[PDB]
């Protein structure tokens, strides 16, 4: 039974869900799966789902073991500018998407430099000059810890599937409901019941220029997003 479920890891989510509900046996299988695939070299959703499913059990022994074996998560926290992405990983690992959103916004300004860090918002030109590596790390964390539901890559593909029309994009990802913009922060859905691409948020107070620059950034094609 359990070995059959083990082979389903390589549809994958159903097996993962089943294993986690099967006591020490199934969880032992999940834990062993991480040991054979962590650290990731490329983002693999199954690995993210295994880690997050185990985290979601909220059992002390599992959580402690995960924190001990994988203190920085399952994905290398790489930065072309030496930025620390652990607080982001920790927020996503705790499924605190609201905090993760806040951190991501702060990290993008930090990535852009002292100018954006001071004014606390971005210019589209700064977005164009973002290093691909940092965007990859940030997006991977969102993607891996949300069953592929969240991430700029997710928003970008929906945008492409909308003929690059932002007015069609907003209702799909829940940032607009007809003629009314979703109100920050209470109007947004900070959990996995949110629509595909709902997070991270990109404030439209200053237009779509930042968003478009981000979606058109070479990182997505370069890293196979």
Residues 10 and 82 in one domain: yes
> Among the three residues 123, 146, 169, which one is the final residue of a domain in this structure?
146
The total number of structural domains that make up the chain: 2
Residues 94 and 2 in one domain: yes
**Under 8 Å CB-to-CB from 35, ≥6 apart: which residues?**
69
- Taking alpha carbons only, the member of 142, 138, 110 closest to residue 126 is 110
Residues 191 and 221 in one domain: yes
User: Which residue is listed with tokens 């500018």?
Assistant: 81
- Collapse the DSSP code of 87 into the 3-class scheme (helix H, G, I; strand E, B; otherwise coil) and give the result: helix
In degrees and rounded to multiples of 5, residue 180 shows phi and psi of -105, 125
Residues 132 and 152 in one domain: no
Residues 30 and 137 in one domain: yes
Residues 3 and 110 in one domain: yes
CATH of the domain at 223: 1.10.10.1770
Residues 2 and 73 in one domain: yes
Residues 88 and 170 in one domain: no
> Among the three residues 126, 146, 166, which one is the final residue of a domain in this structure?
146
**Under 8 Å CB-to-CB from 82, ≥6 apart: which residues?**
none
Residues 102 and 127 in one domain: yes
Tokens of 112: 């852009």
Residues 118 and 221 in one domain: no
CB atoms < 10 A from the CB of 178, how many? 7
**Under 8 Å CB-to-CB from 204, ≥6 apart: which residues?**
175, 181, 211
- Collapse the DSSP code of 80 into the 3-class scheme (helix H, G, I; strand E, B; otherwise coil) and give the result: coil
Nearest-angstrom CA–CA distance, 111 and 75: 19
> Among the three residues 80, 115, 146, which one is the final residue of a domain in this structure?
146
Torsion angle of C-alpha atoms 93, 95, 99, 103, degrees rounded to 10? 40
Q: Structural domain of residue 96, as residue ranges?
A: 1-146
Residues 139 and 172 in one domain: no
What experiment produced this structure? X-ray
Maximum CA extent, the chain: 58
Resolution in A: 2.0
- Taking alpha carbons only, the member of 87, 89, 96, 108 closest to residue 214 is 108
């Amino acid at each position: 039974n359990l070995t059959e479920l083990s082979q389903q890891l390589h549809k994958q989510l159903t097996a993962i869900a089943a294993l986690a509900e099967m006591g020490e046996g199934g969880q032992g299988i999940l834990l062993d799966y991480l040991a054979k695939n962590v650290p990731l070299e490329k983002p693999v959703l199954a690995v993210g789902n295994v880690y997050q499913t185990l985290r979601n059990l909220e059992q002390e022994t599992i959580t402690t073991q995960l924190q001990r074996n994988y203190p920085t998560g399952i994905f290398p926290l790489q930065s072309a500018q030496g930025i620390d992405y652990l607080p982001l990983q920790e927020a996503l690992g705790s499924q605190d998407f609201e905090t993760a959103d806040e951190i991501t916004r702060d990290k993008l300004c930090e990535l852009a430099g002292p100018g954006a860090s001071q004014r606390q918002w971005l210019y589209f030109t700064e977005v164009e000059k973002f290093p691909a590596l940092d965007l990859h790390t940030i997006n991977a964390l969102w993607w891996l810890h949300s069953n592929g539901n969240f991430g700029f890559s997710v928003q970008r593909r929906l945008w492409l599937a909308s003929g690059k029309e932002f007015t069609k994009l907003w209702p799909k990802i829940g940032w607009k409901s007809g003629n009314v913009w979703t109100r920050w922060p209470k109007g947004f859905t900070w959990d996995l019941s949110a629509p595909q691409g709902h997070l991270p948020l990109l404030n439209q107070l200053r237009g779509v220029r930042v968003a478009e620059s981000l979606y058109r950034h070479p990182v997505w094609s370069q890293y196979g997003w």
